Symmetry: D2
Subunit: 342 residues, 4 copies
């Protein structure tokens, strides 16, 4: 049984590889562009060099011919489509590449599968990763469900609305075993440095090592996020893929997935500062270049639909996930891998 | 005062240029790719050649640099963005170009305007044309209004969903005077041959001239729609454009726009056969190559929101619109411009 | 269950592809597939509509050069034995200000076609003959008084020129790398009654026809007249494409071989205007004016040819006189205006 | 203070051009990158960048025209080092569309933005368009390449630099934009990407030394000739050309071949890397199918007379030290647990 991971070098993809190698007998294929950063997969290199259950396929979301070669030659039984331009902030000023990679990237994958299904009966389970950002700037005091209206908060958000409709459409039109996951915040030690809890943790680490004045730079703190560790999120994807295989997930079925621990962003900063010998002496300053034209600033979740379909809960406390992320930046700086403060 | 029409060579765009020339003192710019069909605009060639109030700008939806030159050099005061891959049936097998031209083409326009507004205060009214097709296979019995949830019935439908959220987003994010129109079926003598009422009118005219056996080939008829002549639709667009300029349409506001008259598809056929001397002798046959993986179905009746912002109603009878279209195909065959039966 | 040699024409709705379809139906036993985007102008193919409705030897496949998935479907489902790849943004002048779509459609479009073929060859042994249509504009602004041959240095005179250099190298590369039976044709000017209105000899004939019919002042608007072109009727060019296609099938044309192809008759642009004016009763009374908007940042202003390579591989010369090609084009525009299909004067 | 833009700032050459400009000029430096690109080559710059000391970052993608528009409009660099590309021929074969898009259209996206700004406002930057000796593809044996050598399409990458090269010349000739085009040989050293021949040989030796690989180096075609120089010599050539162009001594769109003095058959490069290793005499070399190419640009020997006639320049760094620096880089990475793929 063969699993393809798109976005293998990313936060979630690299951890899905780890999870599948430790918890299944699956062969794993990691899709990447050849020059993608190795930071998340260095621990997998020897195993890949040894051809022990995991291999790399070189393909770009934006090269349909590369994806054709991948599906024709590898025929993955299950696909975790995690590859995307994942960052809303750059999507404002680089919106064309965000729309191309996320919407057209996903159409390039799904159309490749559709044609191979018509020709040869290829019938893979296809995980299409959407985002809770399809709900953009959601009304306060209400929890999100799978029928909550979509709001375009950013080109990234619109790109994920596109990804989402494509996932549902290809399932509904061609009976491909797609399911769509509208994820809240999933984080932990491999969270990209640009995301809120990771830039806060990283700036604390920079401050502790004397690289930055003891002022954390932030954007809008009037925002509510639900967190869980990727190690929990990934189990939900694996458990959904099994149900999809067994016939229990309708083609194109959508699911909101999040943790149970929700925070106003000042509470996350306070948790991270409490892990620092010098937290009592570190201030916070809102700066203009971290603000957004529209902020999707409220993500609270009713998880009743997902828990009705799989037997799953988040096990890792959010304080441990955050501590892991702070130690990660501490370790990078100690080793001379000085990050941007961004 | 200068008006840009994207999709100038198309059904609606060509008729919008006629409306503005007859009813306003506006200078008119028609955007086109140089090789576009001239069928809808032969009657404007003379006055274009003579530089009388209308001019052509050569640009492509997929060439940002061509749109950059358009907005910088011409600075239209109002923009009717009608250019699209308009046909759902081809969108199934040519999905990438539908998504690229419709979503990214719209993003190319809106990001060009955005940057010009930030640099020089350029503040045009921007009609972003979406479609009732965003509602796709609508939930039987829910009242259909501007807050009904979208459904992705085709790559076309998803591309107009994309277009819709781009229009909304660029309005909300950057205070660009966008408004989004979700129009029901508009038709009349310039309806492209491929659309339902056009292919039926066209096949009847082929049968009346002995080019086809007296069998009309159709797809699914278990569909109900509102119809309006384009010349009514254009009035609604024009009147909205005035309200947007006056400050009365919030940036990014969306509007469903339905005709007065609703029909089952067999009833549209019955109206067309009754304009034929040989109507009593023509069979209708459903064939597979006209069937769609998903067939959209919505009763979009409720115009209470558009009627609240403009003094407007469809005035032209649908029977006259369908007769005009049948006569168009009769005239085309009579001139030896024999169309495909498609 | 009767199986025929199948020809695909990309650019079926264009000047050359429309005439290639006519040629194959009259002179061969081939089934013809016309590739088009559905909304493409019908002007050049109205006379085929009845035949196509009747499923008599010619069909339409809807695909876009920029939609790889659409081409995959076309090659997988139809497996044409021979491909005339004529589809392009064909016009240098618009390429200056719409350069990205010119580069995407011509270079990436051609790459989408060839990569689809490469993959079907490796999997299933699909081995079509592939005509990759390039342009003498690969030589851009060539040194004056010298004949072009196939080893003449390339020059980038426009985004269109660079797109056809890209198209040309892709044609040679897929041939040399994967043993796809490509050949590349670097054509001079081929014209006649379906020449698009924007090209020199077409705009000049169109303007004369507008003047005769009372739609224009007796001034023809032109750009740079210090330019040399070699002309042949498309009806002669398509014969060369056909005969080269048979030689590729036969193993006589190495994968990715390039050929310059052009007519016998070369002219300075004013001579072309005088030939067309001499076909008009209004001809002695019409002035010629250079206007800024028909000028170009760089003009590929010299195209004369050593045709020795193509004539050594096929038994072929242009037979239609250019005066007859030009007369047919003027009569086309007269007919168009008579029928109320009033063109732009562009 | 003069403003320099580097595209491909995170790459082998861009990152070293930033080092070179900071050390040798009073130029403000702008590094273009997509936000997620590898930090490997620029970690040593993060603190400078954080403290806004002469170097900054602008987020743009070659394939997003609007992002490049914001860059030239807002930042108006006086000099541009266009080094960003899909740089690798091997992946270009099976990922050809992205190579063509990023390299040809990416360059068009840059040059068209500059054209429109020059027309409107008189923006007149110097524009280094980096091409490749691979425009000459599979060249004739026994003959040096020069600027008039016939072009040959050896790979989608090769064709993508042919496109890039013609765009460089065209935008210069058509619009009098101060472009120059550089068709480089092999420039290498410690930041050389792991997939390239001398970097994969040197990396595989390091994996063998540290016990991560059997003592067999996997290679492709060894019947190939290359001319090497250290990137620290190449970047000096680009800089000197940028001064000449600013003075008005480089015709708009002028092309230059640039390469070092030291040429080698590939086996000779392997033998120099093995002699740096205590395990040298013990390691086999095995040609493998998955490193072979449909066409190989087999032969890169250079006539450098044109470049030496326009700037006062030659390669100074011996290629032996260049390869030593590369081998020691892969030793350090492995010793620090940054275990590379063996590809
Ligand atoms: N982690 C979260 O909190 C969160 C929230 C909601 C949704 N998601 C979604 O989950 C998925 C994975 O998130 P992540 O945190 O791992 O993101 P990430 O940024 O860490 O990883 C993105 C991956 O996509 C790859 N990629 C980008 N462009 C590509 C292209 N053109 N071709 C091929 N690969 C390309 C990158 O190289 C990388 O491996 C994404 O779709 C993201 O939008 C994440
Ligand atoms: N008429 C209806 O029933 C209806 C219903 C809902 C929405 N709409 C929307 O109304 C608009 C106009 O409809 P129509 O009937 O006139 O369609 P049409 O097909 O007649 O017009 C399409 C136009 O877009 C242009 N276009 C296509 N691709 C282009 C590109 N790459 N660059 C530039 N121009 C390009 C075409 O040349 C043509 O002018 C479309 O956006 C359509 O989706 C129409
Ligand atoms: N006729 C000449 O004098 C001449 C000279 C040298 C080169 N050529 C080349 O010969 C070929 C044919 O010339 P022509 O006069 O017939 O050109 P044309 O402009 O009449 O036709 C071009 C064709 O390409 C199609 N096309 C354009 N973009 C497309 C896309 N995105 N997807 C699908 N189809 C698309 C058009 O619809 C049309 O059918 C072209 O490649 C042209 O560059 C012609
Ligand atoms: N080093 C050599 O031996 C050599 C030889 C001849 C030519 N060249 C050319 O010199 C230049 C620099 O080479 P290098 O060794 O530094 O290459 P590299 O692979 O080390 O660097 C490539 C750079 O381009 C960037 N890039 C890739 N795609 C991008 C995109 N879509 N948007 C923005 N940036 C993108 C990468 O992120 C990276 O910064 C390239 O143009 C290369 O083709 C190199
Ligand atoms: N990335 C980022 N987000 C911030 C910052 N300060 C506040 N935020 C907010 O943190 C929330 C989450 O942002 P982010 O981590 O980028 O992930 P998102 O959920 O994908 O937008 C948003 O409401 C941001 O506006 C900051 O400095 N960086
Ligand atoms: N185009 C087309 N549509 C048909 C045909 N027969 C039935 N229909 C249906 O008529 C409805 C209108 O389709 P169409 O005219 O293509 O417009 P759209 O789908 O609203 O853009 C859809 O439900 C079609 O599936 C036909 O022969 N052609
Ligand atoms: N299209 C066009 N070309 C013109 C005109 N006047 C002169 N030319 C020149 O005629 C030559 C041929 O141009 P054109 O017909 O576009 O074909 P091409 O440039 O060879 O593809 C070029 O040298 C043009 O500069 C004109 O009015 N229209
Ligand atoms: N990258 C790479 N190239 C190899 C290998 N074995 C031989 N070569 C040859 O080494 C030469 C240089 O290739 P490369 O370093 O990829 O740089 P290029 O000059 O950009 O193709 C080419 O002739 C390759 O065919 C190998 O294992 N990896």
């Amino acid at each position: 049984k063969t699993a393809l991971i798109t976005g293998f070098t990313g936060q979630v993809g690299s951890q899905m590889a780890d999870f599948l190698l430790e918890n299944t007998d699956y062969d794993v294929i990691g899709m990447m562009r050849w020059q993608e950063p190795m930071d998340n997969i260095y621990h997998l290199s020897d195993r890949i060099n040894k051809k022990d259950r995991i291999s790399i396929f070189y393909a770009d979301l934006n090269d349909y011919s590369s994806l054709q070669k991948l599906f024709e030659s590898q025929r993955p039984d299950v696909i975790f489509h995690l590859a995307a331009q994942s960052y809303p902030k750059t999507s404002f000023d680089i919106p064309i590449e965000t729309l191309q990679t996320n919407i057209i990237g996903t159409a390039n994958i799904l159309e490749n599968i559709r044609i191979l299904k018509a020709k040869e009966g290829y019938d893979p389970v296809v995980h299409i990763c959407s985002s809770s950002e399809v709900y953009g700037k959601a009304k306060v005091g209400v929890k999100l469900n799978e029928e909550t209206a979509f709001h375009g908060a950013s080109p990234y958000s619109i790109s994920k609305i596109g990804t989402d409709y494509l996932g549902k459409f290809y399932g509904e039109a061609y009976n491909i075993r797609t399911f769509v996951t509208r994820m809240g915040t999933h984080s932990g030690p491999r969270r990209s440095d640009v995301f809120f809890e990771s830039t806060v943790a990283k700036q604390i680490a920079l401050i502790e090592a004397g690289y930055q004045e003891p002022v954390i730079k932030v954007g809008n703190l009037s925002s509510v996020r639900t967190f869980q560790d990727c190690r929990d999120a990934i189990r939900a994807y694996y458990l959904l893929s099994l149900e999809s295989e067994k016939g229990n997930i309708p083609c194109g079925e959508a699911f909101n997935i999040a943790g149970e621990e929700a925070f106003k962003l000042p509470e996350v900063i306070d948790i991270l500062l409490n892990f620092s010998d010098m937290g009592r002496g570190i201030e916070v300053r809102q700066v203009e270049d971290r603000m957004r034209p529209i902020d999707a600033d409220y993500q609270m979740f009713d998880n009743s639909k997902i828990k009705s379909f799989i037997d799953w809960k988040a096990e890792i406390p959010v304080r441990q996930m955050l501590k892991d992320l702070l130690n990660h930046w501490r370790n990078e700086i100690k080793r001379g891998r000085i990050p941007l403060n961004r």
